[PDB]
Amino acid sequence: MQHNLIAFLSDVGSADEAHALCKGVMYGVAPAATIVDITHDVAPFDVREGALFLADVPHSFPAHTVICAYVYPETGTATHTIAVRNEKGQLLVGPNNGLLSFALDASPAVECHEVLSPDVMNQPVTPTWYGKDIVAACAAHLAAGTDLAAVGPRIDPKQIVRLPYASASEVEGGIRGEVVRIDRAFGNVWTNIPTHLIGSMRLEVKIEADTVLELPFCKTFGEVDEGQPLLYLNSRGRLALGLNQSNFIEKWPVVPGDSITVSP
Amino acid sequence: QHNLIAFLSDVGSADEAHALCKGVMYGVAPAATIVDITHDVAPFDVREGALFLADVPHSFPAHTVICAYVYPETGTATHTIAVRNEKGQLLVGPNNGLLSFALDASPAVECHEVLSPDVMNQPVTPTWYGKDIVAACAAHLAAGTDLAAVGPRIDPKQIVRLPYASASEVEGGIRGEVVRIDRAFGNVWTNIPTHLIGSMRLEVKIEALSDTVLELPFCKTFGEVDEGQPLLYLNSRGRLALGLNQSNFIEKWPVVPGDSITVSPR
Amino acid sequence: QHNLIAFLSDVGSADEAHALCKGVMYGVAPAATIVDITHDVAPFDVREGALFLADVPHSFPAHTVICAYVYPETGTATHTIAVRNEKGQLLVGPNNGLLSFALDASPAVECHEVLSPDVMNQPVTPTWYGKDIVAACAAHLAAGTDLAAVGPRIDPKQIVRLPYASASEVEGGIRGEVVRIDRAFGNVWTNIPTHLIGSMLQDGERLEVKIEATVLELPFCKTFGEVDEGQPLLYLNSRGRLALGLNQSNFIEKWPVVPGDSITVSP
Numbered sequence: 001m002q003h004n005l006i007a008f009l010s011d012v013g014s015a016d017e018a019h020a021l022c023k024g025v026m027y028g029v030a031p032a033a034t035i036v037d038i039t040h041d042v043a044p045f046d047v048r049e050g051a052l053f054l055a056d057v058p059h060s061f062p063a064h065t066v067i068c069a070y071v072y073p074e075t076g077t078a079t080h081t082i083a084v085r086n087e088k089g090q091l092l093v094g095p096n097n098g099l100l101s102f103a104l105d106a107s108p109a110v111e112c113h114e115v116l117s118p119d120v121m122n123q124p125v126t127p128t129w130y131g132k133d134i135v136a137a138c139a140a141h142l143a144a145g146t147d148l149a150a151v152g153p154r155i156d157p158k159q160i161v162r163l164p165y166a167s168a169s170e171v172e173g174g175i176r177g178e179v180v181r182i183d184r185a186f187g188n189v190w191t192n193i194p195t196h197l198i199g200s201m202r203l204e205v206k207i208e209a210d211t212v213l214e215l216p217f218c219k220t221f222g223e224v225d226e227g228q229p230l231l232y233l234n235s236r237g238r239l240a241l242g243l244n245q246s247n248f249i250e251k252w253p254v255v256p257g258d259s260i261t262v263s264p
Numbered sequence: 265q266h267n268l269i270a271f272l273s274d275v276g277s278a279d280e281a282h283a284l285c286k287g288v289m290y291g292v293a294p295a296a297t298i299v300d301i302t303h304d305v306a307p308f309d310v311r312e313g314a315l316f317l318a319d320v321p322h323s324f325p326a327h328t329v330i331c332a333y334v335y336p337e338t339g340t341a342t343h344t345i346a347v348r349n350e351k352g353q354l355l356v357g358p359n360n361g362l363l364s365f366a367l368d369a370s371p372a373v374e375c376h377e378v379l380s381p382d383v384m385n386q387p388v389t390p391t392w393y394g395k396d397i398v399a400a401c402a403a404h405l406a407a408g409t410d411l412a413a414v415g416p417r418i419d420p421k422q423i424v425r426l427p428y429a430s431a432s433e434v435e436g437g438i439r440g441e442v443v444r445i446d447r448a449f450g451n452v453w454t455n456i457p458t459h460l461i462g463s464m465r466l467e468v469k470i471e472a473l474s475d476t477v478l479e480l481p482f483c484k485t486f487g488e489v490d491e492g493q494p495l496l497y498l499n500s501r502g503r504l505a506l507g508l509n510q511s512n513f514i515e516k517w518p519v520v521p522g523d524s525i526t527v528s529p530r
Numbered sequence: 531q532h533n534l535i536a537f538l539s540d541v542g543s544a545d546e547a548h549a550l551c552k553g554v555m556y557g558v559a560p561a562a563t564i565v566d567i568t569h570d571v572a573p574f575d576v577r578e579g580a581l582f583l584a585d586v587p588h589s590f591p592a593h594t595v596i597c598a599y600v601y602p603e604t605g606t607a608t609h610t611i612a613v614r615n616e617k618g619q620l621l622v623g624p625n626n627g628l629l630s631f632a633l634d635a636s637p638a639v640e641c642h643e644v645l646s647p648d649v650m651n652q653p654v655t656p657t658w659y660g661k662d663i664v665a666a667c668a669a670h671l672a673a674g675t676d677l678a679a680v681g682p683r684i685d686p687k688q689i690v691r692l693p694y695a696s697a698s699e700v701e702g703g704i705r706g707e708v709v710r711i712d713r714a715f716g717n718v719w720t721n722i723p724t725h726l727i728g729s730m731l732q733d734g735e736r737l738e739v740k741i742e743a744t745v746l747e748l749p750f751c752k753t754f755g756e757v758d759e760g761q762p763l764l765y766l767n768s769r770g771r772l773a774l775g776l777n778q779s780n781f782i783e784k785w786p787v788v789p790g791d792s793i794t795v796s797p
């Protein structure tokens with residue numbers, strides 16, 4: 001039942017003190033906790049980007065983790081904060097605005113509460129920063145031995161707002177998916193096409209804003225010459241496009257939501 | 265005890281430099297927790313660093329060593345100081361005004377110049393007192409060195425302070441200025457405190473190379489206006505701020521620190 | 531014992547990737563302290579990563595595991611290595627030259643290839659050996675795994691080394707080059723060590739520098755504040771090598787210079 005590791009995500013940036021003031025509040029409540037950032041460089045207000053960044057956090061982090069996350073343009077409104085215990089035994093705290101959707105896909109909710117108890121908040125709560133005074137504060141209380149049931153009333157899992165996620169499908173001559181996100185440090189393109197779908201089938205890849213490439217399917221970057229394009233399964237088990245030691249989206253610009261079709 | 269070190273500088277987080285300081289600190293105080301405030305203070309910008317530190321004493325617990333350096337005077341006669349504040353925290357930094365606003369929040373009770381070689385990383389490199397004096401001294405304090413071992417007592421009046429303009433009641437409203445931009449979002453932060461905005465949609469007059477006059481609703485939070493619409497609100501630091509709901513105010517209406525802001529009834 | 535993990539990569543700090551590695555490491559070594567060096571090494575730039583690691587052994591205590599990857603060879607025959615240095619630290623990284631300059635600072639005493647599946651995060655994903663081999667193995671070492679259990683011993687000469695030339699005395703001067711930019715400030719760092727400029731300094735301490743990319747006549751100073759704001763200076767940087775800067779301004783914004791550009795210094 002111990003949760004001494006707090007994994008922390010927001011959209012407030014890492015460039016000023018704000019993300020650190022949250023950690024100050026958390027160390028004051030849970031002075032023995034380990035606090036590690038996931039990132040604070042989610043694009044402003046971008047709940048979907050935050051949700052995508054959290055997707056693989058449950059799997060990589062141990063059971064004694066509190067996932068503390070906010071992207072909270074609804075701060076100071078009726079949009080509540082929730083605290084969840086997942087099937088892995090981790091705790092998650094965040095706004096009920098879809099942010100935790102893909103982390104919960106990875107490890108479903110077992111018990112879910114609205115955070116309404118003043119005793120798990122940093123008082124007085126400032127309306128424009130529930131992320132510090134409710135989300136961070138509550139996560140730290142959970143790390144410091146507070147029972148999940150003490151944060152507020154139980155809700156059903158279906159009361160957690162979920163962001164829709166497009167799945168790739170078999171079409172009439174291949175697999176139709178889309179760009180989910182860019183691997184931005186490198187310029188690699190990540191799709192929603194899972195391992196099991198490319199199983200069936202060099203491949204033709206059609207990128208719609210329209211470009212057709214004939215690409216080798218490789219296990220890794222070094223299997224083609226430097227600067228050459230490849231298809232590969234990324235670290236997350238989904239089909240990706242890259243140039244070996246270059247930047248694919250600088251050569252073929254593509255944004256999230258663009259269609260990607262793969263055929264023999 | 266002071267086993268939590270909160271660390272700020274202007275050396276950036278993009279290369280190893282900020283981490284070499286943590287290596288020195290972990291060597292001296294291997295049981296300390298080190299947490300960054302930020303290393304992305306603009307280069308040489310002591311005032312920006314001072315503003316970023318202002319609310320650190322209130323948010324961090326009493327067992328914190330606030331370790332901060334923006335030190336273009338490194339290797340000169342500008343000394344490093346170590347301070348114990350009214351909250352019981354310790355602060356270490358260049359006596360160049362960097363700690364000024366943190367000390368406004370929680371005044372100095374005890375002040376020393378850091379002159380003892382035994383709290384430094386020897387030999388001290390002239391271009392990086394931040395590592396070899398500031399960071400090293402903070403770690404010795406985290407490891408339980410008495411504040412008196414760092415060097416001699418000085419009067420708190422010898423702590424260099426940065427000037428800070430106050431807002432005031434003027435003919436028919438409140439006149440202040442822009443203190444900083446909430447840069448992740450483009451929100452505008454003023455020096456107008458909650459207590460002055462009590463008597464009084466409001467007229468907001470921004471004076472820069474051109475004047476921008478807006479009629480804005482006073483809201484508790486962003487979602488009280490439509491997406492893209494402007495609002496006046498009290499920020500998380502208790503001061504009047506301007507923003508657009510889920511958009512960037514300064515991208516629409518450019519404003520920089522030092523610009524005048526008046527708020528008056530419609 | 532090695533309870534402190536110092537972590538470097540090229541995956542950036544802007545998304546979750548660097549943190550997923552920390553999650554794996556905390557799972558394996560729950561009592562370890564993890565501190566980033568940086569994740570903002572330029573993509574695939576092994577030499578930049580090697581330069582960022584050069585001064586890590588000296589600054590970090592003996593109980594450190596230096597965990598580093600810049601690994602465009604991930605999923606190939608380029609193995610991960612684990613090394614014990616003369617300071618008693620452990621280092622884990624791709625055998626692609628990344629650890630070269632850290633090993634210059636504190637040489638390898640024992641070296642192994644990381645091949646044992648029991649020090650990896652299974653199943654190992656081919657495009658991220660940095661998570662599933664480098665980070666996982668560093669965590670196992672921090673948790674107390676013996677260095678010899680990671681895989682077979684190799685000779686130090688089997689560690690790939692990136693070439694680095696220090697400057698030399700030529701007819702009447704020092705011929706060096708730009709190694710890296712102090713990018714937060716725009717200061718220029720050369721390969722000219724302390725002992726070479728020492729030999730050439732006279733009373734008044736003024737030098738000529740020729741940049742091939744400009745001739746400047748510059749004062750040799752201890753620190754920035756010795757000349758007026760905006761004025762140029764030569765100085766020995768924090769790492770013991772000659773540098774160029776403007777006091778409280780950006781030298782490379784005025785005089786653009788990139789790594790490998792010649793810098794000649796004469797009386």
Ligand SMILES: C[S@@+](CC[C@H](N)C(=O)[O-])C[C@H]1O[C@@H](n2cnc3c(N)ncnc32)[C@H](O)[C@@H]1O
Nearest residue numbers: 012018045071072073449486500507508509510
């Ligand atoms: C105001 S920020 C807190 C940090 C800020 N620098 C401070 O010190 O108050 C907290 C949340 O507010 C939201 N937010 C910030 N500016 C906003 C705006 N203009 N419109 C809507 N939401 C905003 C963000 O999504 C963020 O998660």
Ligand SMILES: C[S@@+](CC[C@H](N)C(=O)[O-])C[C@H]1O[C@@H](n2cnc3c(N)ncnc32)[C@H](O)[C@@H]1O
Nearest residue numbers: 275281308334335336715754768775776777778
């Ligand atoms: C030199 S930096 C230390 C980090 C650097 N990357 C290193 O490894 O030496 C330390 C301090 O020097 C100051 N500084 C750096 N470059 C400067 C310059 N050109 N003029 C004046 N001060 C400078 C900064 O304000 C900073 O707080």
Ligand SMILES: C[S@@+](CC[C@H](N)C(=O)[O-])C[C@H]1O[C@@H](n2cnc3c(N)ncnc32)[C@H](O)[C@@H]1O
Nearest residue numbers: 186221235242243244245541547574600601602
């Ligand atoms: C793929 S990155 C791991 C992080 C990534 N965001 C992920 O989640 O998989 C691991 C290593 O891959 C290398 N790498 C990434 N993209 C590459 C590409 N297009 N070509 C060659 N190497 C690449 C980098 O050098 C890096 O050290």
Ligand SMILES: [Cl-]
Nearest residue numbers: 072075130131
């Ligand atoms: Cl918030």
Ligand SMILES: [Cl-]
Nearest residue numbers: 335338393394
């Ligand atoms: Cl310094």
Ligand SMILES: [Cl-]
Nearest residue numbers: 601604659660
């Ligand atoms: Cl890798």
